[PDB]
Symmetry: D2
């Protein structure tokens, strides 16, 4: 086969071996992609984690709140992949919201400065990364960001859901710019995945009530999904991101693909 054979793809967002971006990177290399990775603050830890990927991949530092990192990103990537080559895919899998904007801290008590940091990292940065990278992307390219369905409110996720609503809207504008380069921009809305942090939260890290509510949310997800949902398995989400990075959804942009077991299409 080789779904992504020959494609050069930048993958951001790996922080632990349970990160959804770690599985996206693994599956993309299994599929023939040549990768460049970006990591945020603990580069030594990230390098050690990505050593377990099937193939080597250069790791570049990128703090999306750092204008300088962003301004120099395209030059560093070109250096990593070689003059004359461009990227075919970009994976944005970054997100963050201060504790005051999630959990049991009341929705009305999150200070704007925390919300703003969260929106900067989780939403604005999708536009930041596309701005930095489209100049070095090939026609037929694909930009994919990680989302979760924020069309209805829900317990605990609070401001992070607002940040996803902003992100879905940013994606539709990025598609307009990306289109001028022959590039698609889309998001994958995933079901809940037991990442290290999510496990910490279910385990009570942000208050017992938030944990109980997240837990309830996960069970209802598998019940509602007509094909079921396994929160411990990120592979189905990684495969979907690879589908969008491939040439097999060439007429979809500014769009959202739901890799959630079909749960969002069922009331109960």
């Amino acid at each position: 086969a080789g779904l992504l054979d020959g494609k050069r793809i930048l993958v951001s967002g790996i922080i632990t071996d349970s990160s959804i971006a770690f599985h996206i990177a693994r599956v993309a290399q299994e599929q023939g992609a040549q990768l460049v990775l970006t990591g945020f603050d603990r580069l030594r830890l990230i390098q050690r984690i990505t050593d377990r990927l099937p193939a080597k991949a250069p790791l570049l530092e990128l703090d999306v709140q750092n204008e300088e990192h962003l301004a120099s990103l395209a030059g560093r990537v070109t250096e990593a992949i070689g003059a004359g080559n461009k990227l075919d895919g970009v994976v944005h899998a970054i997100g963050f919201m201060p504790q005051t904007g999630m959990g049991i801290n009341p929705f009305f008590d999150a200070p704007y400065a925390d919300v703003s940091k969260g929106i900067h990292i989780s939403a604005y940065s999708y536009a930041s990364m596309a701005k930095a990278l489209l100049p070095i992307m090939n026609p037929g390219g694909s930009i994919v960001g990680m989302d979760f369905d924020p069309s209805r409110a829900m317990p605990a996720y609070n401001w992070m859901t607002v940040a996803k609503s902003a992100l879905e809207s940013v994606n539709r504008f990025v598609a307009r710019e990306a289109g001028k380069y022959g590039v698609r921009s889309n998001l994958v809305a995933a079901g809940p995945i037991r990442t290290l942090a999510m496990s910490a939260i279910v385990g009570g890290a942000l208050g017992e009530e938030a944990g109980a509510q997240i837990q309830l949310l996960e069970e209802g997800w598998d019940q509602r999904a007509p094909i079921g949902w396994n929160m411990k398995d990120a592979t189905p989400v990684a495969k979907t991101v690879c589908a969008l990075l491939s040439d097999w959804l060439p007429a979809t942009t500014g769009d959202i693909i739901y890799a959630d077991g079909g749960a969002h299409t069922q009331l109960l």
Copy 2:
């Protein structure tokens, strides 16, 4: 009749006699409401404008980015309406986005600090105001915010559309808190209205292309609306906000009512 007879309603957002909140205030007083107004920076100008309203209404200063204004808002309103009385309605009609986030300035060139100010004023503040005012609202009360449909991208509005997407998501969370007080929270998504600023923009204030595009957007709106759309008339939008402030939509919250001529329900 007297649709809002006896209700005490706070109305924010009046800046000129063409402000949508000026018409909402006028219609609400025609309907029997007793109002309290809040204004942002030019209080002398706002007082002079609101002198033309059918009845008197106390004017309080409120800069939604000022924590102190917000912290003292409930006490000032109680003083204006009298100890022992509470509000039955709150109208949020505030919005703003720096020029870099709208117009012909490229979407990718808006700095985050500008976007963040815009989201603070246009979205977060809906939660700020509800936080400040629910403690002084009566069961059966109603909070209404001004929106425009951001479900699809569009030219020129750029980051302001992202700010509406965030606002619609904030509204669904505010409904959850407001519900504990027996209060509803909803938004009215209006068609384009020729406010002073919008007229300035169509006239070229943010670049000729942005103006031409806004103009095209307005014409297509009236064509698509099965009952037509008159951008020079804010009355149909004011009436809709009054419908939500009344007791005649008592089972709708966390929701959006479209006062746009039905344009959003038609492709062409």
Copy 3:
């Protein structure tokens, strides 16, 4: 007050004193409307039930599957309200699906003839009634149909949910025709209401599983609704239909207003 003062409104759909149309008629007369009622097969029973309405209202027979009834409807209504007068409002509150299309009978086992009857009565008829009545409606008029949110599948409702999906689509086309008359067309999506039939179904009339599932659906509705949901009280739904029949939502058509406690805006 008098929300509907002086308006002539046709109300279809009354079959028992627990029919949602019975409450819509009662509230509309409390609000000053002069009504004309249509009933389907048991006119003697319907007359006896509507005798309890606050005011008298002529009852006309109308089987929406009868072309002749439809062809003569406008003439009979004009006779009931008097030559030279026209209707200002029309309420469609009719729906039906054979048992094979609902309940525990498997979704795949409903024969098309049953589904087709159900869609004829529940969806096509909204266009049939508008076709018959727009010629005798005044500018500023309003047509309202009863809906329930079919955007996601759910247990038990099966083909009736498909019929609501068709109805919402018919409504957007009827708005286009109604607009030529200066008339609005909208639907009210209600939460579950304990009508006689729904009570029969919860009580097991279409299989124990369907009943258990409907029951579960109702409880979750009140839990999800930020202001709660009372399935035994149709008044909040009647008031919402009256809001659309009034002149207070004059810029909304081809649209759906949710009178469901805000449940559809919350995941959990």
Copy 4:
């Protein structure tokens, strides 16, 4: 590569060499799929057309309005693919609406019998085919139907848009049944494609106004699509259907993938 290597896929809907199902079949064979085709009435013509496909494929007759064809379909397919083998994919690409339900014939003038035939063929049949075929489908299988976005009304398509709204709702119920077999069910919402019939319609076959409106609809589609839209090329739509038939979107069901150039995500 071989995206569909080894999969057995039934493809319905081929009537001319410009049929979207002809391209779906061609691309699926280019990708390694072994096909079985079904055709509706002119089997001699269909056989002659499919002779041009890259590989041979048995052709079975199937009139979805024929209960007998449906009742015997699974047995005929098993015979064509051999005892002990099951299908991995099913493509529903059938649709039809009598002329009275489309075109310049007024929306209110389509008789229910025509609408009902149209809904039978275009919507109910998606459930009919899944009912017939799930018993002979393998876990991990995929059912895909052709759709066009009916969320807003539009000129000319009239009742066919209502039939798509019904179909999208049927798909969400079929996903629930298909899930019990480990099978996904999804639709691809395509942009306008110049099929023989659509070309006939643009050319005036259903009235000059319908043609002018369809033409306007197509131009606006390419303008709105951030990556553009080529109505003469069905390949991008075929590739998307193959993506859903593959194992690369394994967590999506009861869903709709838009292969429309991203046009539905942009207002203008």
